[PDB]
Amino acid sequence: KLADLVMWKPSFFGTKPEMVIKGGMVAWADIGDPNASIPTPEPVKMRPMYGTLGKAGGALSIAFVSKAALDQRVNVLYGLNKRVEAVSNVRKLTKLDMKLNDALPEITVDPESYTVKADGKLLCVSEATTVPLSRNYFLF
Amino acid sequence: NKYGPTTGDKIRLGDTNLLAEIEKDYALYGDECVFGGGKVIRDGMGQSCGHPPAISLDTVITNAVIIDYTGIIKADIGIKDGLIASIGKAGNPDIMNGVFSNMIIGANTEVIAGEGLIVTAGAIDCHVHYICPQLVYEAI
Amino acid sequence: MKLSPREVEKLGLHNAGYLAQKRLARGVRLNYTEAVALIASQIMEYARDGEKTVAQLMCLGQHLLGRRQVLPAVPHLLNAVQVEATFPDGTKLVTVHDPISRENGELQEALFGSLLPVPSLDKFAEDNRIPGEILCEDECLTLNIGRKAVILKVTSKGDRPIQVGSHYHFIEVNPYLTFDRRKAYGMRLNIAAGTAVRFEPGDCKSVTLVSIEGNKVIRGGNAIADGPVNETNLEAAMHAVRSKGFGHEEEKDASEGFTKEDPNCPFNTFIHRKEYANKYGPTTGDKIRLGDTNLLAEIEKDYALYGDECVFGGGKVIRDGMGQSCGHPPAISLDTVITNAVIIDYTGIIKADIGIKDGLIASIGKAGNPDIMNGVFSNMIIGANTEVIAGEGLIVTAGAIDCHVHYICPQLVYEAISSGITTLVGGGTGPAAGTRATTCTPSPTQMRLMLQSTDDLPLNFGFTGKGSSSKPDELHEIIKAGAMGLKLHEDWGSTPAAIDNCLTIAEHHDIQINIHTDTLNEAGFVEHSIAAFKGRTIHTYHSEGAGGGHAPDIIKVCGIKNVLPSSTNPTRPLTSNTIDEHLDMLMVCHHLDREIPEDLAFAHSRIRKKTIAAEDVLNDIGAISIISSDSQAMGRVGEVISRTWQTADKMKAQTGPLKCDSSDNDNFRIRRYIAKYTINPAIANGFSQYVGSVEVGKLADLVMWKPSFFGTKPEMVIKGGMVAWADIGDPNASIPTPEPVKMRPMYGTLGKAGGALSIAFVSKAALDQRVNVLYGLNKRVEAVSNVRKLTKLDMKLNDALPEITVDPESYTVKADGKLLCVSEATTVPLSRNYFLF
Amino acid sequence: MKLSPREVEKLGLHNAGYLAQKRLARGVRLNYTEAVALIASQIMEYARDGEKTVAQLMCLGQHLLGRRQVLPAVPHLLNAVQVEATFPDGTKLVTVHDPISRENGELQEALFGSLLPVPSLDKFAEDNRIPGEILCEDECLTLNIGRKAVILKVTSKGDRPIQVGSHYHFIEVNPYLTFDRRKAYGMRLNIAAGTAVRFEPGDCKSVTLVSIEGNKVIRGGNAIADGPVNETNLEAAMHAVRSKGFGHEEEKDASEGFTKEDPNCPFNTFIHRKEYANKYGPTTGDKIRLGDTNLLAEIEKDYALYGDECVFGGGKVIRDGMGQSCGHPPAISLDTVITNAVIIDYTGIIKADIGIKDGLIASIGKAGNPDIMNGVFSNMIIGANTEVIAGEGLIVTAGAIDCHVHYICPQLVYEAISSGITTLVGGGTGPAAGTRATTCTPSPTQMRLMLQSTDDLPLNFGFTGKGSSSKPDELHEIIKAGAMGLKLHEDWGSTPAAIDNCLTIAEHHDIQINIHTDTLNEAGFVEHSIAAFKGRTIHTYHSEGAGGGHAPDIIKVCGIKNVLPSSTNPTRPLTSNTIDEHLDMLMVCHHLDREIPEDLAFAHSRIRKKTIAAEDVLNDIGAISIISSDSQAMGRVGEVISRTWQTADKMKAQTGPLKCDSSDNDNFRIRRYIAKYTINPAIANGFSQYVGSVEVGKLADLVMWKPSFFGTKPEMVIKGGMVAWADIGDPNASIPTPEPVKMRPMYGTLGKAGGALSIAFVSKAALDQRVNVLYGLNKRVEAVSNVRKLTKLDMKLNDALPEITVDPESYTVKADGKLLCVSEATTVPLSRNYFLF
Ligand code: NI
Ligand code: NI
Ligand code: NI
Ligand code: NI
């Protein structure tokens, strides 16, 4: 598969990644003062890297289209530099093809109370007063 | 104060203790190429109207103090096809002496006013780590 | 064998020569083409034998064919035969001058090396034209009138010959010529433009000089008197003369005066019309026979100023400071100038120089250098960066436009341009049955493919989709894809429902609709199809009907105002073999059986001598506005032009001059007919602002013709200002004229040059879509337009709208109640005198 | 007919055959080309009859033509005739070996199927060369000297034949061969490179082996002894031998020693020079006759190490681990290697392998595999990714450079490359009158169009503008547009004012100026034009004058230091037909009349036997530095090379060896002349660092020639390292040699390959403008340079500067007071023996 990968520090996992690799090349990454002797001094911000300049972006990615469009060679017609591939195998799929999320409970919803049940069991969950990956990381 | 210094004058580089002395000047006092309303670079005057179209400079940098390892001089700089076409006294040979065929200011010539300024070659950094594109911007 | 290209070529030439020898052997009187092939091949054979020298063959070549062994026109057409061959001392060029010099040739020599039996002289069985002959009044023209003049004695003090051209600044001549330099200042020789005067060492000749004109600025030469003619520069010049040692001797009593329109004036130089025409082509009043037809074109006007003709060559007019300007800005120099061209266009028959700039016709008039010539406008300046195409003695016309093309194969494209066609409009995708029957490029993918396929070909192209549908849906798509028009064809269904829908689509997209009606009268008769038009503009293909259409009266459309009618060329004109040929062509193409009465009835209802005869007349009176091919689908792509002229020729022969014709020439008929394959086709299809005529601003799609071969085989085809195809001989030859001379593709056909010289015409919807970008086309793309408000009245010189009737039983056709009778021709010009087969 | 390409081709072959039959029928002694055509055509006819088998025709084909029915050289040139035809049992290949085997052929058979009368034998009328013959001293060469050697008995225990090649690692051979594997370690057969030894089942033969050299690394085979030759690997190898069951038997007393330069040494393998030359082409000391001329080229040196020749083929040297390296980095493998080439270049006549990399000549020397061969440098390594062009027996030269080209039509480009020309310099826009007369591409739009037009053609191109102007303005523009030079022509005006201005422009742009002077002496005599040069560098076209120039002494320029003089080819060399041919060529091209004394006087003043004769001598002594065509404008594009050699041939025949020539060969004269169409043209135009000679770093534009056809018809033309054109036969044939064999375009001419293999030369102003980008050119573009400081002294081997005088009345020419007399040749080589016509 394409080398579209994201690097994370465990302490910042799920919130702010270190770098985003697109098609094997760094597309975006945390970098500080560009005039600095090293790349870590402030201000450190997520910034576009070489994968975003010139036509590099297209060489690292794919524009997904239908097979009719590819048969038409829209990639040529439109003068696209980005690689183009057709989507496929989506008409024989069922919930069972969803990896680790193939549950098919019988859902009912009370018309008046809106109470929801899965296979006759109540789906109760109190509201959270706080969530992680928030206050510890964002400026605003 | 009008055309930048000439032979013998000295210029302090920034707020350093270094003094650069103009070693020579290609100008002929009185025929300086100065652009502006009622000034020298105008049709039939400092701007030639009797030479072939093809030899008009693309751009002329007027009255520049040049600091280069080859010397510190005062001269006009002619640019053609993105290259340094000439260094010396620019203008119109129809009314000025000392204007060679490669330093003619014509109708199709742009003007960059160098009077009072120092011109140097663009710097060349040969130990660059292409860590991020932002340092390229900082560099130029 | 390790055969080089030229050897392969020469083998072909030999083959043609052998064919000619076999024909000669049975007593055939050879035509121009066969005579050339035979003579050139014989020269090669004698060279192979190694027993004859170049000088000997220049002589033997004149004894091969006599007047009795060739057609009457041959002695007139055949000035010389050239060919190179490998002699014992290498490759040598041999030119046989005036080959037909005797009554009977030495046939054993004509057949040398063929092993064919020599025929007895009685085997060659015994007043026609001089093809392309020029007719001039017995009169002289006066050169350089209205100028100051002087006669000076010029003595040569050199030990080598000195020759001076007509437009050389006389004071600038070789220092070894002695004469009064002061009197020569600002003057030039008063002699025919392009000629010179020769001074052998020690010679002294009196010469007449005339003042230069225009801005009167001297430039070039020895830079003795550079600058505007005036007192100050004269003195500077004389100082240079003495200083540099240029021969000078005052001639105090040299006769001085002015040139004028006076036969008695001693300073004048005269030239007979005959010699003038032989040098620069004819001028006002002269007449030219078009090919071997009976048509005579008269020069209506000439922009030249006698004496200042632009002639290129050694010692001639187009040289630095002389005819070639040296005092104008670089940007305004013409890219190319066609000098002394006889222009035949529907707008008139004139004599003029043609200026080309950026692939467009920049100007028509008097070209040259305004520094020494009068009447040279800023847009006709010949400069250092100007190329020269010599038009003197030739006819120039707009490139032909065939608008009924079936893109069955690419080879017919080559045949088309080699005949003088530079624009093609039709439909097709190759030899598929659909295309073999109709001018349709059905799908958007084939539209894209055909546009990409022909993108490097040096011709303008227009593709039409299939309009035979009762719904607009698919029509919008093919038009958006690039179609510049639509074809309604009975094979796809030409019913009232389809006709109406198609025309409604046309009203919205501003494209022309071409139609091949319901021959079977299945959904209705001709009046019903016309009703379906609902007064909307439509182009009826092969309106006579042999090519298809309501039987037997489709020709009635020629009298309908909103109809732009065209005819295809196989029925042009009605000749002895026409009916038999067409009847069988039809049945073979529809797989019909003569023995089946139904099939025969159908065939006879569609191939009618009466409607074809009427078509001759209708074309002549301007009731049919266009002539097209219907290439390889009941039509010949290389005969759109010749067929047009053969029709005009036949009509003149049988009915005489047209009402609007003068009786001293056939200019009107000529203009009416040339409009049929040039301007009218462009107007009907919506791109008349780009091509269709020799007018300023339009593309420089031009064809050069020798009068003797006009309407049959052109000299060269210019596309977008560059030569695309042209007659050229042996590529290894020392010159470009030796055999075999064939029409060949030139630089305009290599790489992507073709696209840079042409236009792919599409609909405005397609251009809005930018299909040119989407398809990666290199050829320029423009949208067709202004085709929905056209009527027969917009067809140039072919706006006749007679009421046509057709007798249901006899098929007798009448125009406004008058019979359209014309006997069939037993022969036609532009045929036997020119083709090998 | 539904004719396939091959059927059309075979019809052409038959036509050539019939031509040959008719010639034979009248008693003509056929040349090589005609003999092949006739024999091949007859084989096809007999096959059509279906009465003869392949075996029968292999025999009948030898009885068709006898020695008496063909030219004397034919029996030498004609080794075999091949052709395929449809027999009753399908298509079959027939090879007629040594067809000329009898005194008289069975002419009824030679004429079979032609219906031509059989000529009596007396009709064929009765000491010349062996074209391309190799001359060798009666001597033997010693192979693989200085190596360890051993003689071993090898027994086959297999039931099938086993054959081993010269460079196969012996210990790696078939396990069914039994011998002392330990002694064979690191050794190979001491036999002629490319040969083998065959072992029939049960056979036992003693063979001499020699040690491999270079790095001495074994690779490939059965991987028995892979690795560097040493004690440790030997033991590992013997263990593998025993372990895997490879036949091994110790031969304790096998004779061992070393090979040396000793005729008595028992381990040596010798080969006579005759057989060596027949296998690998000649070596040092041998001489080769160029075509059927009288010139003999002697190999000055050979980079080969006898025994290690790179020969490709089954069981030969260029195979994995053997001659083909298997131990170097991928990136340094040559793209292509031309093996055993006899190189003829102005820098010398040598024998060597030629390495090609990235379209450039990467190396010249000894190629191969350094793992087993000595003397193979890192830049001449043959690897897995290396293609092989077999040069053994052939001559390789740089592609020719024609610098006086009129781009009149594209067909002459094809003729040019098919003859050995890979670079064209000149001007034109197609067949326009301007171009037909001068080498000028006038406008920037035509400059762009011509560059785009020729962009896919596999030749380097240089276009020149019109320099005939007294102002610099327009010249700057055409140069900026892409012109790499300018042409001053009298037809546009070659006056002192224009000459001076043009040269001033040249000094600024660093481009060369080519000039056709004022033949009419209108503005001055030759001394005045020379004065106008003001000592500046200029190239004088056709310096002799027949092609144009001050009458009658333009040839004086050959003695001017700042003049780089060239000649055009129709006057090369002076022969019996030259004068008559040229006189008429001139008058026909200028429309002159013999009956008009002025016209005749002009013609006689320009076509002079005396100056043409002088031109022969001036070229011979190096006073004229270049030979060009003047294609279709008084010149033949396909004869730049042949004419050069015919001149050298004539001069040797009439004056003998040159002063600087050795008397055992004509190497110096050969080098002097080849420089005329290779290096000199490139130096004069400013691109000698790219092409012009067979030297490392330059483009691999090379031509392969068979000695017998040298100077006339090459085998293949390599452009930028890829075959552009080559001799190839019937494309449907089982092999590439059967008839018809013709020069044909190869893969280097398809798609955009042509541009990838070539360079479009432009001015530095144009490159600064990036016209390559602006014009969308795929072909590489480089700027010309270093042409303004050149003098006659910079013309390689043609730097002679004699003082030339021309008698004003007699036209007698003298060099330093000495007469330049040379009688006209009645015949020339490189002609009758090769061309069909
Ligand atoms: Ni039709
Ligand atoms: Ni049709
Ligand atoms: Ni010339
Ligand atoms: Ni020339």
PDB file of C-alpha atoms in Angstrom, chain C residues 446-584:
ATOM      1  CA  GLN C 446     -14.398   8.958 -32.029  1.00  0.00           C
ATOM      2  CA  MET C 447     -14.714  12.772 -32.262  1.00  0.00           C
ATOM      3  CA  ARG C 448     -11.766  13.109 -29.896  1.00  0.00           C
ATOM      4  CA  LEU C 449      -9.823  10.395 -31.724  1.00  0.00           C
ATOM      5  CA  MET C 450     -10.400  11.911 -35.180  1.00  0.00           C
ATOM      6  CA  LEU C 451      -9.372  15.376 -33.949  1.00  0.00           C
ATOM      7  CA  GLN C 452      -6.225  13.894 -32.401  1.00  0.00           C
ATOM      8  CA  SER C 453      -5.618  11.686 -35.436  1.00  0.00           C
ATOM      9  CA  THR C 454      -5.618  14.549 -37.940  1.00  0.00           C
ATOM     10  CA  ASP C 455      -3.936  17.046 -35.607  1.00  0.00           C
ATOM     11  CA  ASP C 456      -0.617  16.999 -37.518  1.00  0.00           C
ATOM     12  CA  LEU C 457      -2.141  17.081 -41.010  1.00  0.00           C
ATOM     13  CA  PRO C 458      -1.736  20.423 -42.871  1.00  0.00           C
ATOM     14  CA  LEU C 459      -5.444  20.916 -43.619  1.00  0.00           C
ATOM     15  CA  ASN C 460      -8.285  22.570 -41.742  1.00  0.00           C
ATOM     16  CA  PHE C 461     -10.780  19.983 -40.527  1.00  0.00           C
ATOM     17  CA  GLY C 462     -14.422  20.010 -39.550  1.00  0.00           C
ATOM     18  CA  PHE C 463     -16.192  16.896 -38.282  1.00  0.00           C
ATOM     19  CA  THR C 464     -19.940  16.323 -38.304  1.00  0.00           C
ATOM     20  CA  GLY C 465     -21.886  14.033 -35.987  1.00  0.00           C
ATOM     21  CA  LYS C 466     -25.001  11.959 -36.633  1.00  0.00           C
ATOM     22  CA  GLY C 467     -28.049  14.202 -36.512  1.00  0.00           C
ATOM     23  CA  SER C 468     -30.547  11.453 -37.282  1.00  0.00           C
ATOM     24  CA  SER C 469     -32.353  11.376 -33.954  1.00  0.00           C
ATOM     25  CA  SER C 470     -35.756  12.463 -32.685  1.00  0.00           C
ATOM     26  CA  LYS C 471     -34.298  13.499 -29.324  1.00  0.00           C
ATOM     27  CA  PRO C 472     -31.789  16.319 -28.661  1.00  0.00           C
ATOM     28  CA  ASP C 473     -29.968  14.546 -25.802  1.00  0.00           C
ATOM     29  CA  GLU C 474     -27.253  12.735 -27.776  1.00  0.00           C
ATOM     30  CA  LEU C 475     -26.855  15.575 -30.280  1.00  0.00           C
ATOM     31  CA  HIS C 476     -25.837  17.970 -27.487  1.00  0.00           C
ATOM     32  CA  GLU C 477     -23.119  15.510 -26.481  1.00  0.00           C
ATOM     33  CA  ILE C 478     -21.516  15.003 -29.899  1.00  0.00           C
ATOM     34  CA  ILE C 479     -21.605  18.765 -30.473  1.00  0.00           C
ATOM     35  CA  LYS C 480     -19.997  19.424 -27.082  1.00  0.00           C
ATOM     36  CA  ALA C 481     -17.382  16.808 -27.980  1.00  0.00           C
ATOM     37  CA  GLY C 482     -16.281  18.767 -31.037  1.00  0.00           C
ATOM     38  CA  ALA C 483     -18.757  18.405 -33.910  1.00  0.00           C
ATOM     39  CA  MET C 484     -19.105  21.592 -35.972  1.00  0.00           C
ATOM     40  CA  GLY C 485     -22.243  20.333 -37.663  1.00  0.00           C
ATOM     41  CA  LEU C 486     -24.606  17.381 -38.006  1.00  0.00           C
ATOM     42  CA  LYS C 487     -25.555  15.045 -40.827  1.00  0.00           C
ATOM     43  CA  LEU C 488     -29.104  13.783 -41.351  1.00  0.00           C
ATOM     44  CA  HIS C 489     -28.868  10.683 -43.552  1.00  0.00           C
ATOM     45  CA  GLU C 490     -31.611   8.296 -44.685  1.00  0.00           C
ATOM     46  CA  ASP C 491     -29.371   5.370 -43.751  1.00  0.00           C
ATOM     47  CA  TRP C 492     -29.699   6.499 -40.119  1.00  0.00           C
ATOM     48  CA  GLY C 493     -33.192   7.787 -40.816  1.00  0.00           C
ATOM     49  CA  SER C 494     -34.081  11.144 -42.385  1.00  0.00           C
ATOM     50  CA  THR C 495     -37.657  11.393 -41.149  1.00  0.00           C
ATOM     51  CA  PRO C 496     -39.594  14.605 -40.397  1.00  0.00           C
ATOM     52  CA  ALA C 497     -39.277  13.926 -36.651  1.00  0.00           C
ATOM     53  CA  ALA C 498     -35.477  13.648 -36.882  1.00  0.00           C
ATOM     54  CA  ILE C 499     -35.194  16.585 -39.278  1.00  0.00           C
ATOM     55  CA  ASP C 500     -37.167  18.856 -36.968  1.00  0.00           C
ATOM     56  CA  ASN C 501     -35.297  17.835 -33.819  1.00  0.00           C
ATOM     57  CA  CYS C 502     -31.940  18.177 -35.549  1.00  0.00           C
ATOM     58  CA  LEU C 503     -32.751  21.670 -36.822  1.00  0.00           C
ATOM     59  CA  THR C 504     -33.988  22.764 -33.394  1.00  0.00           C
ATOM     60  CA  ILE C 505     -30.615  21.632 -32.043  1.00  0.00           C
ATOM     61  CA  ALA C 506     -28.917  23.619 -34.838  1.00  0.00           C
ATOM     62  CA  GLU C 507     -30.800  26.782 -33.887  1.00  0.00           C
ATOM     63  CA  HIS C 508     -29.405  26.447 -30.364  1.00  0.00           C
ATOM     64  CA  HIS C 509     -25.788  25.584 -31.204  1.00  0.00           C
ATOM     65  CA  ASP C 510     -25.262  27.707 -34.298  1.00  0.00           C
ATOM     66  CA  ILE C 511     -23.904  24.864 -36.450  1.00  0.00           C
ATOM     67  CA  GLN C 512     -24.935  23.882 -39.962  1.00  0.00           C
ATOM     68  CA  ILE C 513     -27.075  20.846 -40.722  1.00  0.00           C
ATOM     69  CA  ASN C 514     -26.347  18.782 -43.815  1.00  0.00           C
ATOM     70  CA  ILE C 515     -28.955  16.399 -45.140  1.00  0.00           C
ATOM     71  CA  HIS C 516     -29.350  13.359 -47.370  1.00  0.00           C
ATOM     72  CA  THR C 517     -33.126  12.989 -47.657  1.00  0.00           C
ATOM     73  CA  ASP C 518     -35.558  10.062 -47.700  1.00  0.00           C
ATOM     74  CA  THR C 519     -34.981   8.645 -51.209  1.00  0.00           C
ATOM     75  CA  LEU C 520     -37.643   5.989 -50.547  1.00  0.00           C
ATOM     76  CA  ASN C 521     -40.281   8.638 -49.736  1.00  0.00           C
ATOM     77  CA  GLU C 522     -40.978   6.297 -46.809  1.00  0.00           C
ATOM     78  CA  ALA C 523     -42.165   8.932 -44.317  1.00  0.00           C
ATOM     79  CA  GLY C 524     -43.186  11.434 -46.968  1.00  0.00           C
ATOM     80  CA  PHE C 525     -42.352  13.114 -50.262  1.00  0.00           C
ATOM     81  CA  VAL C 526     -39.926  16.000 -50.813  1.00  0.00           C
ATOM     82  CA  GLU C 527     -42.581  18.586 -49.890  1.00  0.00           C
ATOM     83  CA  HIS C 528     -42.906  16.905 -46.483  1.00  0.00           C
ATOM     84  CA  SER C 529     -39.184  17.102 -45.737  1.00  0.00           C
ATOM     85  CA  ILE C 530     -39.171  20.752 -46.792  1.00  0.00           C
ATOM     86  CA  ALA C 531     -42.114  21.357 -44.450  1.00  0.00           C
ATOM     87  CA  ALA C 532     -40.074  19.720 -41.685  1.00  0.00           C
ATOM     88  CA  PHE C 533     -37.368  22.369 -42.242  1.00  0.00           C
ATOM     89  CA  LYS C 534     -39.925  24.923 -41.056  1.00  0.00           C
ATOM     90  CA  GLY C 535     -38.046  27.672 -42.883  1.00  0.00           C
ATOM     91  CA  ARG C 536     -34.803  26.946 -41.032  1.00  0.00           C
ATOM     92  CA  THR C 537     -31.381  27.041 -42.700  1.00  0.00           C
ATOM     93  CA  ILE C 538     -30.168  23.674 -43.980  1.00  0.00           C
ATOM     94  CA  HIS C 539     -27.553  22.398 -46.424  1.00  0.00           C
ATOM     95  CA  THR C 540     -28.811  19.809 -48.913  1.00  0.00           C
ATOM     96  CA  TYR C 541     -26.053  17.448 -50.084  1.00  0.00           C
ATOM     97  CA  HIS C 542     -26.030  16.223 -53.724  1.00  0.00           C
ATOM     98  CA  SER C 543     -29.244  18.136 -54.403  1.00  0.00           C
ATOM     99  CA  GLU C 544     -29.649  16.555 -57.845  1.00  0.00           C
ATOM    100  CA  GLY C 545     -30.360  13.205 -56.194  1.00  0.00           C
ATOM    101  CA  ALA C 546     -28.146  10.578 -57.840  1.00  0.00           C
ATOM    102  CA  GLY C 547     -26.163  10.686 -54.603  1.00  0.00           C
ATOM    103  CA  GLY C 548     -29.366  10.263 -52.628  1.00  0.00           C
ATOM    104  CA  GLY C 549     -32.688  11.955 -51.984  1.00  0.00           C
ATOM    105  CA  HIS C 550     -36.461  11.887 -52.504  1.00  0.00           C
ATOM    106  CA  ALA C 551     -37.037  10.112 -55.808  1.00  0.00           C
ATOM    107  CA  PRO C 552     -37.296  11.622 -58.294  1.00  0.00           C
ATOM    108  CA  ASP C 553     -37.758  15.292 -57.331  1.00  0.00           C
ATOM    109  CA  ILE C 554     -35.317  16.121 -54.518  1.00  0.00           C
ATOM    110  CA  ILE C 555     -33.761  18.677 -56.895  1.00  0.00           C
ATOM    111  CA  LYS C 556     -36.755  20.934 -56.134  1.00  0.00           C
ATOM    112  CA  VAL C 557     -34.880  22.116 -53.028  1.00  0.00           C
ATOM    113  CA  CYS C 558     -32.708  24.299 -55.286  1.00  0.00           C
ATOM    114  CA  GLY C 559     -35.646  26.707 -55.374  1.00  0.00           C
ATOM    115  CA  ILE C 560     -36.173  26.852 -51.610  1.00  0.00           C
ATOM    116  CA  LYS C 561     -34.929  30.058 -49.968  1.00  0.00           C
ATOM    117  CA  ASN C 562     -33.712  28.524 -46.694  1.00  0.00           C
ATOM    118  CA  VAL C 563     -31.853  25.773 -48.543  1.00  0.00           C
ATOM    119  CA  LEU C 564     -28.120  26.017 -49.296  1.00  0.00           C
ATOM    120  CA  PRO C 565     -27.793  23.424 -52.088  1.00  0.00           C
ATOM    121  CA  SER C 566     -24.631  21.618 -53.135  1.00  0.00           C
ATOM    122  CA  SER C 567     -23.912  18.862 -55.620  1.00  0.00           C
ATOM    123  CA  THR C 568     -21.385  16.027 -55.456  1.00  0.00           C
ATOM    124  CA  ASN C 569     -18.937  15.560 -58.343  1.00  0.00           C
ATOM    125  CA  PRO C 570     -19.503  12.228 -60.105  1.00  0.00           C
ATOM    126  CA  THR C 571     -22.488  13.650 -62.047  1.00  0.00           C
ATOM    127  CA  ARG C 572     -20.479  16.739 -63.016  1.00  0.00           C
ATOM    128  CA  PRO C 573     -21.010  17.194 -65.853  1.00  0.00           C
ATOM    129  CA  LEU C 574     -23.405  14.922 -67.725  1.00  0.00           C
ATOM    130  CA  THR C 575     -21.315  12.923 -70.197  1.00  0.00           C
ATOM    131  CA  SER C 576     -21.698   9.921 -72.500  1.00  0.00           C
ATOM    132  CA  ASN C 577     -20.719   7.407 -69.806  1.00  0.00           C
ATOM    133  CA  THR C 578     -22.386   9.057 -66.812  1.00  0.00           C
ATOM    134  CA  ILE C 579     -25.694   7.151 -66.793  1.00  0.00           C
ATOM    135  CA  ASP C 580     -24.326   3.648 -67.466  1.00  0.00           C
ATOM    136  CA  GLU C 581     -21.598   4.201 -64.888  1.00  0.00           C
ATOM    137  CA  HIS C 582     -23.918   5.536 -62.181  1.00  0.00           C
ATOM    138  CA  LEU C 583     -26.668   2.983 -62.693  1.00  0.00           C
ATOM    139  CA  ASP C 584     -24.224   0.137 -62.102  1.00  0.00           C
TER     140      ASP C 584
END
